[PDB]
Amino acid sequence: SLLIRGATVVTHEESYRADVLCANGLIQAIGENLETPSGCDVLDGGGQYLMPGGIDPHTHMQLPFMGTVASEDFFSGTAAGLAGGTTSIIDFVIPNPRQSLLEAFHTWRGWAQKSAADYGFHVAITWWSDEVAREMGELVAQHGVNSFKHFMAYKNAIMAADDTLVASFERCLELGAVPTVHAENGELVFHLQQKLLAQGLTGPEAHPLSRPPQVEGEAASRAIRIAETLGTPLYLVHISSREALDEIAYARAKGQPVYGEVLAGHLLLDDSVYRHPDWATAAGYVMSPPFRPVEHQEALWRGLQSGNLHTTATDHCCFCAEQKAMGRDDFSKIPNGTAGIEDRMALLWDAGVNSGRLSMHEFVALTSTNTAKIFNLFPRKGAIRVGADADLVLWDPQGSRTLSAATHHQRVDFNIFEGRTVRGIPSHTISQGKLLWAAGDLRAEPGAGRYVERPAYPSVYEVLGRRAERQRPVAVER
Amino acid sequence: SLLIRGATVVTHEESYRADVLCANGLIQAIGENLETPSGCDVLDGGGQYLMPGGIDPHTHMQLPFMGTVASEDFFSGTAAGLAGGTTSIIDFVIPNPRQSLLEAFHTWRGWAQKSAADYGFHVAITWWSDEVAREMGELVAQHGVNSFKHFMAYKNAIMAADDTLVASFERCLELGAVPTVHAENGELVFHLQQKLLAQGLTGPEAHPLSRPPQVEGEAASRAIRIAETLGTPLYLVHISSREALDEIAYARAKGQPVYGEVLAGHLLLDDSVYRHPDWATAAGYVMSPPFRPVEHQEALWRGLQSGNLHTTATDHCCFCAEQKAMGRDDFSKIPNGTAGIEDRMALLWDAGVNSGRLSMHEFVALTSTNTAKIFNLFPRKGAIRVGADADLVLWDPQGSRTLSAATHHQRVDFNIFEGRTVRGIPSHTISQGKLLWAAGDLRAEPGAGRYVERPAYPSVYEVLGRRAERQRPVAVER
Ligand SMILES: Nc1c[nH]c(=O)[nH]c1=O
Ligand SMILES: [Zn+2]
Ligand SMILES: [Zn+2]
Ligand SMILES: [Zn+2]
Ligand SMILES: [Zn+2]
């Protein structure tokens, strides 16, 4: 048993002073001046905020990708996420083309067994056949998967063309699963990569030039309108561009269920990072989509404030300087990805709440509750109520931290926010009711985390259902 | 020679009283009370408006298509255009996949020699290879073509996927040619067509359901964004939807050279036409894009008024009842297309000018001058000025005409505006300085029209070149 006493509870919609009791991995009681069970550890949260633990729905722990394997494994990644107040992740099963999905799924369950905190998976659809359609049904019915990932970029690899997107989205509808998309036009990226290389522009500064923001806006428009035509919801991962955000807003203004996810990097960094004089420094920012001219950061913030972006994530995909250097002579070969699982919540609090573009309640909604709702984990997760998983974070608004690769718990030799000082840190992280991060001490244990099943048919599917019934076609009688 | 006396000259920007003298196919003199050369014919235009003859940039005379050949041929179609005030067309060479473009071009020249008025061609890119790219250059350099058409629908036929779109648009940029696009997502069309057929919805009412508006908005988005990425202008044919119009307005607002074309059918008809209890009547409206719910008509009129739609055309593609009946058990086999070359100008005048939606100057811009400027034919066409081609229409603002398949000159048994009465009609049409339509008397002759060459590099390409030079990628030395 673990009792957090004297703090202010901050949810996605309200604040109030109360104590919180956890036991057996669940939240047992909430209230002022709670009784203390015998032999129950006590945590003093005076002057701090008690919030749901962060959920990161976009991580790539130890992903084999672009000629190599990510430097962060499932244990060091989930542990680092605990240090930064994040208590569960959704990662990605990425089968190779013509490789079986259940095969990939069990393989990934294997790798993820070492997780120190709760974890789940999105399954990517990297090819199509009647068997993928059948396997998708199995993953939802028997293995707790309720979301499928589609890559519109990475031509001559994992890219899903329109024919796949249509088939798979239609399958998700049948299964009550949520289609999710990496929205970049693969044909234009491939075309621009070759053209820049043929011009001899091989540095990291060519990476943004190879996939400018309209390449994302285009794919977002296409994913969104396939989803509209087939009558499914749609979740777009790491939106970086005004173009893509405007497409989401346009569809939502048409009341379509479209969600957008954003990373701290795309809220706070611009594309000048790729022109850094030092190659390894610039290479460190190479991910897709890339960082953008400053006007896109401001559009994304307004996306958060307006309700047109819905979740924060990290695309946590680490590669050390030596792996980055795999493309020292060809930006197209630099393994794509940045780290951020540990830094997401502090970064957003410091830039959003301290500044105050975001209220404390929006901070919560954007770091856990919205993700939980979208993927049908609410109120089990991202919620402070009796019966919910005891995933919590205690937040010192006056604590300070300076992000550096030399001191962060993420196993990677680079931090895209190196040297940045944030006011507002997680003093204590609580996962499954146990205190796994405390005032500098990390208590993560390999294998401590559970695999989290997400049930199919989130509530959006009931409204979609009624809509589809109103729109059934009537033949003309002749 | 031919002198038009006493009319009000109306251009794309102004109105003034003057006579106009034509001779040798050209406009010779403009001024009040011009002297009459001896032997010159005189036309009294008192109380009427003298405007440039209409240019219809979207016709398909005797096109072989969807199993058959359009009922209108190049003589009957251009003659019918003349009765309606339209003095020149741009048609489409549509090579079959793997067919040489040059081969198809010469064949089409044979088909079009019988035209009664000036004509030109757009050439469609229905497949890709190095030969295609070479033949595009030859068509521009030797054959007066400066625009290339791309079909984004017609899966498993003339459809261009992104790889062809990108390669062709790049070729277009190299040649100073205008890419034009039929913007519908073919994968979604094909998927919806089979779905609806599988459910037994075989009638014409399924045609609009098989290609809802967002299918067009998606393809407009994608064509527009490819164009932006490659640095070309872009011309989208027959825009029917708010979604597509919004994509054009959005790219035009970012400063991008995007032009939109609209048919009178999509300005004035709604999709209730496909539910007519008579099969032949409903089939008569079947074209792609289909006619839309009424809110899209309002949006289109608004595009015209705001400057986000730029040209009018007809997609003149005629099929009689027995030909339409090829799809009596399968709407996907109904040959797509409607008639309008003869009716476009009166329809737009009556609905746009009489209502005050459009000024008379906007009417001229939208029926001739904007098309001329976009395809590099201004001021040879669409302009009343000494030396311009003598293509003129004399317009009686209080004349009246009732549109009817029983009385029109279009060689087709269906009119999508059957029984509509319009106020403001062409009393006389002058082509190559000759009076070919004189209040009810059509004097069109087979073979009188000239093939019209269009020079490459319209003016927009000078601006694009200056932008490209400013945005040249620049490496970082390390
Ligand atoms: N060529 C065409 C004629 N008519 C149509 O409706 N669509 C076409 O693509
Ligand atoms: Zn991604
Ligand atoms: Zn990712
Ligand atoms: Zn068309
Ligand atoms: Zn057409």
Numbering used by the authors:
A (entry chain B), B (entry chain A): 2 to 479
Lines from the paper:
Dihydropyrimidinase (DHPase) is a key enzyme for pyrimidine degradation. DHPase contains a binuclear metal center in which two Zn ions are bridged by a posttranslationally carbamylated lysine (Kcx). DHPase catalyzes the hydrolysis of dihydrouracil (DHU) to N-carbamoyl-β-alanine. On the basis of an analysis of the amino acid sequences, DHPase was suggested to be a member of the cyclic amidohydrolase family.
The complexed crystal structure of PaDHPase with 5-AU was determined at a 2.1 Å resolution. Two monomers of PaDHPase were found in the asymmetric unit. However, only one 5-AU molecule was found in the active site of one of the PaDHPase dimers. Similar to the apo form, the global architecture of the 5-AU-complexed PaDHPase monomer (subunit A) revealed a TIM-barrel structure embedding the catalytic dimetal center (Znα and Znβ) and a β-sandwich domain, consisting of 17 α-helices, 19 β-sheets, 2 Zn ions, and 1 5-AU molecule. The dimetal center in the PaDHPase-5-AU complex consisted of His59, His61, Kcx150, His183, His239, and Asp316 still self-assembles. Lys150 remains carbamylated (Kcx150) regardless of 5-AU binding. 5-AU interacts with Znα (3.2 Å), Znβ (3.0 Å), the main chains of residues Ser289 (2.8 Å) and Asn337 (3.3 Å), and the side chain of residue Tyr155 (2.8 Å). Dynamic loop I (amino acid residues Pro65-Val70) in PaDHPase is not involved in the binding of 5-AU. However, we found that 5-AU and 5-FU binding poses to PaDHPase are different in terms of orientation and binding residues. Znβ is not involved in binding 5-FU, whereas both Zn ions interact with 5-AU.
